[PDB]
Amino acid sequence: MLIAIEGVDGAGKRTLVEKLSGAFRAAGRSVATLAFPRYGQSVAADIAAEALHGEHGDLASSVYAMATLFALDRAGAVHTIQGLCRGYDVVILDRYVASNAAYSAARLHENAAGKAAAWVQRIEFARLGLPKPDWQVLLAVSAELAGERSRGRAQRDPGRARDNYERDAELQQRTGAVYAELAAQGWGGRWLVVGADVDPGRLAATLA
Amino acid sequence: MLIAIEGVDGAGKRTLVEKLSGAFRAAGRSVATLAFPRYGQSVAADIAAEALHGEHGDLASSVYAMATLFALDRAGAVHTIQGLCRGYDVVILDRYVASNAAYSAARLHENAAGKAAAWVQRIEFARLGLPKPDWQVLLAVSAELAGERSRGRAQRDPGRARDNYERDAELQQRTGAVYAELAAQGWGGRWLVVGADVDPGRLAATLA
Ligand SMILES: Cc1cn([C@H]2C[C@H](O)[C@@H](COP(=O)(O)O)O2)c(=O)[nH]c1=O
Ligand SMILES: Cc1cn([C@H]2C[C@H](O)[C@@H](COP(=O)(O)O)O2)c(=O)[nH]c1=O
Ligand SMILES: [Mg+2]
Ligand SMILES: [Mg+2]
What we know:
The structure is a homodimer.
Chain A: E1 2-6, H1 13-26, E2 31-35, H2 43-52, H3 63-75, H4 78-87, E3 90-94, H5 97-107, H6 115-127, E4 135-139, H7 143-156, H8 169-185, E5 190-194, H9 200-207
Parallel strand pairs in A: 1-3, 1-4, 2-3, 4-5
The structure holds thymidine-5'-phosphate (2 copies) and magnesium ion (2 copies).
Family (chains A, B): Belongs to the thymidylate kinase family.
Binding site for Mg(2+) (chains A, B): 9, 166
EC number (chains A, B): 2.7.4.9
């Protein structure tokens, strides 16, 4: 089973991944986890991150360039994903293809039925052959609360300064709204929308 | 030995590669050839080409995005290049890293000592670990003549329509001038500047 955890910056995704993996393991399932972008493991992922911190000239000003780098990062992990799905009961992703649709649409002021989300579908699922997830879980959080979490993280960690997307409050709000539409539409596969108070034991039961 | 053939669009590079490989083989050397971008062999190369023909939204409007895709294409061929250099006497490339420096600088109206060429050095040779060529051969041609060749090619071949860079005459002229500076500077390794009338037998002797 392939599960993707989605949502805006500072939504609590990495914590939900650890809680969910604990819940599956408590129920006897083997769990593997992977997080995109794969910082350190691909040049595409690292250049993208650096571009969001102000490097690499005009790269980050192109919406489709940034999307392409994240897609190329995932394309480098296809055989890895397919291998994990063979070896493990549950594979849990911290961000996946839907992050590219939500952020790209939001940067362009488009909705979930617009051009960017359709491009992401065409490139990543069809052309690059990335598997569609069995479940995509939207961790829906107020944009204000998520933004406070990102700010807090940068304050206490010098290696977690906010990037260009995190600093853009209105982008984060628009991205939350596109994500809600993608879930309602069942984009890429079925979605669950959960809040910050979701129970990990029940959540894993729904997904099992 | 690793040789790169460089120069503007329509300069006659692919023909020089075939003539040069013939000259080396006539002298008893095994020759392997590779052409960048590697259309068909990498997603980065294909997306870049499609972006230059008007696809993928705002991708082609970023100079650093386009450079990054060509660099990522080459990064996918590093082990291939290293393998060819082990197995063959002469490896001949139709375009290599210097194409990224010349076109990127030209798009930004920079010269060979500017920021883009320095970025290409830092990313491709140092960070990605692409081998520096033993020889880079600049096939220097009038920009007007090269532009006529590109136009002619599109006229007789429906699968060779000109791309955004080929249609930009002033970009092609600026790119020729940056290339001349890169050669004079010995950027990336030693250069030879040849004309359209260069003798392939003598050229191969110089390079052998
Ligand atoms: C994985 C991914 C992230 N992004 C964004 C969301 C974040 O603001 C940023 C870096 O991801 P991060 O928040 O997980 O660590 O890039 C995309 O636009 N597309 C993608 O495919
Ligand atoms: C290989 C390469 C090509 N280019 C350009 C030159 C051409 O106008 C175009 C496509 O290459 P092509 O002319 O060999 O077939 O992209 C770069 O800007 N950087 C590179 O690294
Ligand atoms: Mg973030
Ligand atoms: Mg061309």
